[PDB]
Amino acid sequence: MGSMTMDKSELVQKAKLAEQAERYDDMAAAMKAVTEQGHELSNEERNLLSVAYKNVVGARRSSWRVISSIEQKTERNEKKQQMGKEYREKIEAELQDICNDVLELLDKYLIPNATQPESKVFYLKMKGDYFRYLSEVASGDNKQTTVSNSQQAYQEAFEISKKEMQPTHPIRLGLALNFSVFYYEILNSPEKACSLAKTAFDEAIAELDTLNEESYKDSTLIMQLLRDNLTLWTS
Amino acid sequence: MDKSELVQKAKLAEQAERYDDMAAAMKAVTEQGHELSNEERNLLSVAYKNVVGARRSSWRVISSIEQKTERNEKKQQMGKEYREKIEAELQDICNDVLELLDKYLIPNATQPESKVFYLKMKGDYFRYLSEVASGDNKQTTVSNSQQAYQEAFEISKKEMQPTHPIRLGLALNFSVFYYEILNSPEKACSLAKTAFDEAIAELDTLNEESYKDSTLIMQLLRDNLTLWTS
C-alpha cells in the first residue's frame, strides 16, 4: 500500500514496530507521514517522531565524528585522503538531508500547529538542536547561517520558557542544557555556556521542595546532566 | 575506484559502523575477480555478518511481536507484512553472498584453509536462509547448508590442525546448525565436544599465548555444550 493511504493510527503502529526492530529510518518515515497529515501531534506521537529522528541523525553524527578523527591521523596519501574526504562528504550530505527534513516539518507543521507554550518551547528547542547539528559540520558562510539560526531558535524558546514554565520543568531544563552546549561547542563561548547552565541548575535546585516524587525524579534527571557538563567544563 | 581505494573505503565504513557501505565496497572488490587476501577476506566476512545480522535481529523481534499479539488482528497482520519485508531483505543479502561464493570465492580457493573458510560461509548463509524459510524452499536451504558444512568439515579434518581457529569455528557453527536448524541436540553436542577435546589435547602440548583466537572459540564451544546438556 503506502503512507498516503494509511490513517494516523496505522502509521503510529508502524512506527512502534519499527522502533522495536531498531529500524529507525522506517520509524522516521512513518512519523514524518503522520506529521504531514497536518494535525497537532499527541505526546506519544511527538515522542515517536523525536526518537526516530534522534536515532537517524545520531548515527550520521557519530559516523561523521569517527571519520573526521581518522582524517586527522591519516598518513598523507592522495588516494586515502581523497577517499576519506569524499566519504566524510557523503555522510555530511546525508546529515544535511536529514536535518532539512526535520526543519521543514518544524516550520510547516509542528511549530505553526503548536497550541500550548510547552509545545512551542519543545519544537523551538528541536529547531535549535537540528540547526546545531548542521552547524557541527558546516563551513564558511553557511556555518554563519546555521549557527545564527540555531541561536535564534534556542533564544525564542528560552524567552517563552522563562515566562510560561517553572525553572524545574524538564523541557526548560533540557533547553538550558542544549543551549549551553551550543554556546560551549558551537560559539566557543565557554563562560556564557557555564553561566547559562549554572543559572538553570541553581534556580531549579532552589525549587525542588515544590515537587512531588514523580516530578522530582523528572527534574533531577536533567539537573544531573547540567552538573555533569559543568564538572566537565570547569575541571 | 581501484581495489586499494575500495579496501580503504571498507575500513572507514567499518570504523563508522556503516556496514551496508562496507559490504558494498567488499562486494565490488570481490567482483574484480582476484583471490582475496586474508585481510580482504575478513573485511568481506565482517561486513556481511553485520549486514545480515541487523536483519536477523529485526526479524526475530518482529516475529516475536507478531507471534505474541493476541486480540488485535490489525497489529498482527501489520507484523506479518513487516516480517515479510525484512525476510525479503534478508533473502537478497544471502543471495548476494552465495552468488559471490559460487562465482568468485570458492572457485578461486586453492588452499585447504581458504576452501574451508568459504564452504563454512556457504553453510552459514544457507543456514540464515533456513531460519526464515518454509516448505520446499526450507528443504532446499537446509540440505544446501548441511552439504556445505559437511564438505568443509571433511576437508578441515584431513588438512588442518584441531587448534586451527577456522576448523574450530566451523565445528561451532556446524553444531549450531544441528542444534537450531535440525533440532538434533545429540549430534550438536557430539560435534562440539569432539572439536573441543581434540583442540585441548593438542593445545596442552603448546604455549597457549599464540592461540588466543582458538581458546576464545573453544570457550564458546564449552559454553554451548554446558547450556545444551544441563
Partner: peptide, 15 residues
C-alpha cells in the same frame, strides 16, 4: 551462539 566523557545533550520524552 555461533562464531563471532562527552558533554551531554538531552531530548525530552514526556508521558
Amino acid at each position: 551462539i555461533s562464531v563471532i566523557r562527552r558533554r551531554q545533550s538531552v531530548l525530552n520524552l514526556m508521558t
